Design a protein around this ligand. Structure first.
Ligand SMILES: C[C@@H]1OC(=O)C(c2ccc(F)cc2)=C1c1ccc2c(c1)NC(=O)CO2
Length: 249
């Protein structure tokens, strides 16, 4: 009886804490190591979420794993923007209740410009007054936004799921009385915003791949969950096996 949207609300991961330790200095190494542990905890939640996401179990298991590994940074970034919007009206980057970045933290992390790019997305949520239902559907479209260039196991199952979620977003936006007279314009602003995530996420991934490769030299710690994702994904990236999907490019 519940709609896919109702299911998406039910399965949305609860907000987690970073374990930020106020007895340690805010060096880039400490901040990045803390963020990496946070992201590891969030990614374990993303895997559990994906297991009960409507339609996802109908893709081959290998494709489910691939899509998580090809989208993880987009999923985390998009959820970060939502939390920042909801809990601070996009004044800060709300990584977790115990890890909230102002401009000082953005500098201390050694990721100022990357954080500024993310902050711009959260500001677009304010401009749009993005709704929770739009957010939940768009997050699934991000899961389905980047594919191997040499093929998923089932193209057909992937295209069916992606088409279904695009239709969910289009129907929701165009049928909502809050959007009357402007609903197609809003739909295209939302799809343009999804496309803009690829630029930002590529940049975030490049820096993360760097500190991963140089982890021991740079003293930037990564939890096993991220080591699993990055060890599987980085060779595919280096080989050129990544195809971002765009609505308008
Ligand atoms: C994965 C983590 O989770 C997030 O939400 C973000 C994030 C950070 C800033 C932003 F604007 C949007 C998302 C993360 C992250 C990104 C790059 C990184 C590392 C972690 N870690 C490094 O060592 C250096 O590169």
């Amino acid at each position: 009886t519940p709609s896919p949207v109702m299911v998406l609300e039910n399965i949305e991961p609860e907000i987690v804490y970073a374990g930020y330790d106020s007895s340690k200095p805010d060096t880039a190494e400490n901040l990045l190591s803390t963020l990496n542990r946070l992201a590891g905890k969030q990614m374990i939640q993303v895997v559990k979420w994906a297991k009960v996401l409507p339609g996802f179990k109908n893709l081959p298991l290998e494709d489910q794993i691939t899509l998580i590994q090809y989208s993880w940074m987009s999923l985390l970034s998009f959820a970060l923007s939502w939390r920042s919007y909801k809990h601070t009206n996009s004044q800060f980057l709300y990584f977790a209740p115990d890890l909230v970045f102002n401009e000082e933290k953005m500098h201390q992390s050694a990721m100022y410009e990357l954080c500024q790019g993310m902050h711009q997305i959260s500001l677009q949520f304010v401009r749009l007054q993005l709704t929770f239902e739009e957010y939940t559907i768009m997050k699934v479209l991000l899961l389905l936004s980047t594919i191997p260039k040499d093929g998923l196991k089932s193209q057909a199952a992937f295209e069916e799921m992606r088409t279904n979620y695009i239709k969910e977003l289009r129907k929701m936006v165009t049928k909502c009385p809050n959007n009357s007279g402007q609903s197609w314009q809003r739909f295209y602003q939302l799809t343009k915003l999804l496309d803009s995530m690829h630029d930002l996420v590529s940049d975030l991934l490049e820096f993360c791949f760097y500190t991963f490769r140089e982890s021991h030299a740079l003293k930037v710690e990564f939890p096993a969950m991220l080591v699993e994702i990055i060890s599987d994904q980085l060779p595919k990236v280096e080989s050129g096996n990544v195809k971002p999907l765009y609505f308008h490019r």
